[PDB]
Symmetry: D2
Subunit: 267 residues, 4 copies
Amino acid sequence: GLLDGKRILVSGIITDSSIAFHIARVAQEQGAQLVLTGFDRLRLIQRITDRLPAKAPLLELDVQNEEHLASLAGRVTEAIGAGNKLDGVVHSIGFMPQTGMGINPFFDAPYADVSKGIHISAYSYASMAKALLPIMNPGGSIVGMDFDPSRAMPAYNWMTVAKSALESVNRFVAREAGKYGVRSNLVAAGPIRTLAMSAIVGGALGEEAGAQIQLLEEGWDQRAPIGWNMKDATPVAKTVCALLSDWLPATTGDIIYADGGAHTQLL
Amino acid sequence: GLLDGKRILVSGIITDSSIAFHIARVAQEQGAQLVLTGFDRLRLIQRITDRLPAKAPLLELDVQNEEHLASLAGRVTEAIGAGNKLDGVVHSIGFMPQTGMGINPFFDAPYADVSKGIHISAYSYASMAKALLPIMNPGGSIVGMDFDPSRAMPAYNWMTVAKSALESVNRFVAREAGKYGVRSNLVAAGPIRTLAMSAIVGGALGEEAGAQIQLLEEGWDQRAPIGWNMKDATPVAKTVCALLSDWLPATTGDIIYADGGAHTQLL
Amino acid sequence: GLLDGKRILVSGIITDSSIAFHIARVAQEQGAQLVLTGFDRLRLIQRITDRLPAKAPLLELDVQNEEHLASLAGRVTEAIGAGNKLDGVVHSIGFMPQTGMGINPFFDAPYADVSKGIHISAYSYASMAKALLPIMNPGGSIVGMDFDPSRAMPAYNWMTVAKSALESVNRFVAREAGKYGVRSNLVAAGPIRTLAMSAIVGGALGEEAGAQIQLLEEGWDQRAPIGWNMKDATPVAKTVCALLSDWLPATTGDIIYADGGAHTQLL
Amino acid sequence: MTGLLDGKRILVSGIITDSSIAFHIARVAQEQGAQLVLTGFDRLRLIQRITDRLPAKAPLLELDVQNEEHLASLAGRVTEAIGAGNKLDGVVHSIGFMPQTGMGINPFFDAPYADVSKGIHISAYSYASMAKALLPIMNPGGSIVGMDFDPSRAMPAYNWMTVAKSALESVNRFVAREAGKYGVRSNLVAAGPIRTLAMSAIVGGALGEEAGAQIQLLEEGWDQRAPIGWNMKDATPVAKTVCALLSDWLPATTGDIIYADGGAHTQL
Ligand SMILES: NC(=O)c1ccc[n+]([C@@H]2O[C@H](COP(=O)([O-])OP(=O)(O)OC[C@H]3O[C@@H](n4cnc5c(N)ncnc54)[C@H](O)[C@@H]3O)[C@@H](O)[C@H]2O)c1
Ligand SMILES: NC(=O)c1ccc[n+]([C@@H]2O[C@H](COP(=O)([O-])OP(=O)(O)OC[C@H]3O[C@@H](n4cnc5c(N)ncnc54)[C@H](O)[C@@H]3O)[C@@H](O)[C@H]2O)c1
Ligand SMILES: NC(=O)c1ccc[n+]([C@@H]2O[C@H](COP(=O)([O-])OP(=O)(O)OC[C@H]3O[C@@H](n4cnc5c(N)ncnc54)[C@H](O)[C@@H]3O)[C@@H](O)[C@H]2O)c1
Ligand SMILES: NC(=O)c1ccc[n+]([C@@H]2O[C@H](COP(=O)([O-])OP(=O)(O)OC[C@H]3O[C@@H](n4cnc5c(N)ncnc54)[C@H](O)[C@@H]3O)[C@@H](O)[C@H]2O)c1
Ligand SMILES: Cc1cc(=O)oc2cc(OCc3cn(Cc4ccc(Oc5ccccc5)c(O)c4)nn3)ccc12
Ligand SMILES: Cc1cc(=O)oc2cc(OCc3cn(Cc4ccc(Oc5ccccc5)c(O)c4)nn3)ccc12
Ligand SMILES: Cc1cc(=O)oc2cc(OCc3cn(Cc4ccc(Oc5ccccc5)c(O)c4)nn3)ccc12
Ligand SMILES: Cc1cc(=O)oc2cc(OCc3cn(Cc4ccc(Oc5ccccc5)c(O)c4)nn3)ccc12
């Protein structure tokens, strides 16, 4: 049990393809006791989370809702029991309106759209850490999901901007989390076919979704020295669990790349 | 005449200490014909800009005002004359509310304040390029001001997140501007005593402002192999002019460090 | 056991303070079956390895001796039993002559000395992977020890160049290892009081050794959001074991920073 | 005053053919008023014919960066060429070499250290040894510029030259620490691909039958990646970037890398 006895809050399950679903599955297989947070369709998410290896309380969390955030630690504490604290927090949340993605012109995305995406995808990492650090044990770990935004790329558009914001937020979350003996890190994952990829990325690409996703999949697997499988979230979930474990105890404010080594190779 | 006969739009002048004031001064000393944009205190900005080596048309430009941005190209064309286009555009604009700066807790900055800062400091780089690219000549150059946000640091707080988003925005503006034969780059300057430093950073640092700024100047100057004088914007102004000129014609989506070499040295 | 049943080669032990000694100890506490390699003071190394939880075979390996490298895989197979292969390889080797370190002028290190340092510290990562890759199992992992060379610093001098070379070598060794299903990563560790730190770094600093090392420990701990203990190799050793495990299976050609997050913070 | 490098005395090393990056650096620097001192290696009679194709006449000095005597006499020979009492305002290092075993389709692991070490000596250590030799005859406000090819990520064919470029980048950061004492800047120009003798003879030669396909993929792929396009046949943009660094217009940039690659390294 890599996470045996650890109490871990995992956010971001929307379907069984979600990276958070696989983080939760691997974490439960490794002995973690989970609290899950879901957004919007809690009744559908409930149905999905029933397919996880073990039962886990499901709490509603809209990161844009200040009352959900203010009552969060209290709702987590009643779910895990008084006296118990969290050892891990998984932020696997992202959003960007379709206007800030795909073939929609980069300059045409209104700031209202971009700002909502930045709020959910980047600011929410600080807001979740602010709400959960008061109930985190020393030695704990906060992990957020990133997609390497160091270079501009096709389709990802304003989400790349949101991920660059996220990386910077992570380094500041590490400064605040250090006061609690808590580490804060991002897992920069390769492309995994999720509902976000299909509905947000795919949908915003339209006529170009097929070619772009094919080129992304073939190019990523070629670039990755050990290959990359866009339909297998397990290596990403295992990396998130390594950061939640006690086996990366000196890493904070950082980014672990679970991308097959793709970011290290030009071609 | 490094910028001889170039029509250059310079935004960001508020006082004679502004980085945009020194860029405007150096650019005019190099033969550039300027169009200056100012925000909020245009009567006072007219007084400051009257101190430049040559008088230049001053236009109002609030980067949050959609009408100012939509009318920008037409107002510039009216200033430079029909049939003329801009060769350079300088974005030297930044803002971050007090809550997102200094000794005020990072976690206590509301997203409304952070979003306002990201709008002005990062999104406006894309909205200014979108407004001005249709009126820019091939071979042109768009330059924005950055402050190395790759590592977290005391006091800079959410402005670091805005600069990280700005760096990502710049890489996407480079893609769009490339279609016009225009380069887009950021100049990451070392610290310079401007109104933004004293009023925004210093204001948010409270009683710890004098010591933190003195510590920053000494540290930066010690780390920089060629030294650093935060009272002198000229080295920074010259670096922006090098980017506006045809002497860096193969550089786009990039950050040029005008910081004394500080970011290349640990101690 | 995180490394249950894995056969791992650990090079680089000279004293019980060596980072490789703690990597070997932690790997053995986690079920790894080790094969140890040592250089020059084999008798001392044998006494040192007698302090490890389990007595592992000790193999002579001077990384500048082509006979030792050409016979390495055969000697390793004699040690771990024919029919058995390595699951992991740890490179924890470094050397730089005194002229290429400390207060000795950077410009005065003769190339013969710098080349020796680069050969042991950087090229040996590729020569070790070349010898051991044919006897490594798919899923295997090669880990090297690095010290963040992205920025110049005092005293490290030509060893910073050797580490920059090593980071590049690591990225190519990942291209080669990838075809065998083997990962290749580096652990950029924070400062640890080892024999190399006192004899090589401290030795080259002269009478400035205590003050410089005291400043390094204080500065590193100050910068690390989770703190840093120069007398504690265990967090570093734990990180190397995480890379040797199946829990980072999508990371290759990469660098994981086991430095307390110090590289992500300016101050 | 009249030219970006007016009145500056600049040493330019690395000219071998008129396609060399150093040749175009020399040409553009002379076009901007720089008085040059050129350095050449091995084929000095052939190089003298190449250096006569430049806009203005410049002295040509022999310099094998692996030769202690050429380095020890260098500042003296430069002082003789520019006149005593005059100093260099710039130094350009556009030198590189890596034996075939360390390049192309030759297996990365089979490159012997003797070969790799020669390449790192010529391509990375020499940047420090040239600075050590020329900093004592450089003026405050001076500038040392070296040539780099972005080694932050592994790539096909570049193999051990990537390792030398990584070492060079780290050397440049330390050369900045030393040059700073003299008020001199030290930077690299990470240029995009340019059709030079090194590309054809060393890279192409090491690529064997894959030379044409890899060069065509490199050429078109870089142009595509670069938001402003990239012309592998035009070294002028790179030459202008080196002159920009040798000028007084990047006065606060040291120990750094300026990318003259059309922006390609910023795009995935
Ligand atoms: N799928 C990939 O290839 C990939 C790669 C790298 C990083 N990521 C990151 O992984 C994370 C999860 O994405 P995914 O690919 O698993 O997709 P997904 O669609 O399964 O997950 C996105 C999640 O964000 C949640 N979310 C959106 N708005 C929210 C709000 N206001 N409040 C709370 N939750 C909200 C959704 O409910 C959903 O569970 C995101 O941060 C994403 O950017 C994904
Ligand atoms: N001063 C430094 O040390 C330093 C260092 C690195 C980068 N920078 C950057 O330089 C730029 C200019 O800052 P400065 O230091 O010269 O300070 P400054 O106060 O002189 O400049 C900031 C400018 O932003 C303008 N601005 C604010 N909100 C705006 C809006 N809504 N629309 C249009 N303009 C708006 C202000 O009117 C002012 O002219 C900023 O991007 C800043 O982050 C400054
Ligand atoms: N100590 C630190 O603070 C620190 C920090 C980051 C990285 N590192 C790296 O970790 C590694 C281990 O060093 P350490 O700090 O544990 O010091 P150490 O003195 O314990 O180990 C250095 C080892 O290198 C071996 N070595 C030297 N020349 C060799 C050769 N020719 N062939 C084979 N082995 C050879 C020595 O025998 C010794 O075992 C080195 O690569 C070092 O640069 C150390
Ligand atoms: N050509 C490109 O695409 C490209 C791209 C980026 C960087 N670079 C770098 O630019 C520099 C110049 O290369 P180039 O492309 O102009 O090729 P080139 O063949 O024209 O120049 C290489 C030069 O190095 C010289 N040299 C080799 N060994 C030497 C020694 N022992 N002493 C002195 N000089 C020596 C050669 O004589 C020649 O003048 C090299 O450092 C190269 O790595 C080239
Ligand atoms: C290199 C490359 C080659 C190519 O041919 O095409 C590309 C297309 C790309 O851009 C589009 C994209 C990003 N990804 C990975 C992902 C998918 C879902 C994510 O979750 C989200 C959650 C909310 C909002 C938006 C996204 C996410 O953050 C990352 N897949 N598709 C990126 C790179 C290339
Ligand atoms: C290393 C260090 C040591 C130390 O003791 O203290 C520090 C304080 C720092 O953070 C505070 C800061 C940043 N600077 C530089 C600047 C000043 C004005 C800017 O303009 C703005 C425009 C709008 C909004 C906000 C700022 C700007 O973008 C950057 N000066 N003050 C950063 C680093 C250290
Ligand atoms: C910021 C700072 C302040 C200060 O006052 O002083 C410093 C000295 C530093 O540079 C010197 C150094 C590096 N370290 C960490 C290490 C120690 C041993 C290693 O092993 C080796 C094996 C073979 C050869 C050389 C070293 C090693 O690779 C890294 N400790 N000392 C770096 C930074 C500062
Ligand atoms: C992106 C990409 C796509 C692709 O399909 O293929 C590639 C092949 C590459 O690697 C091979 C190479 C590097 N270049 C650029 C150069 C050419 C000459 C140089 O000068 C030297 C001086 C002495 C010794 C060796 C080289 C030099 O430093 C860099 N041209 N060929 C690199 C990148 C790609």
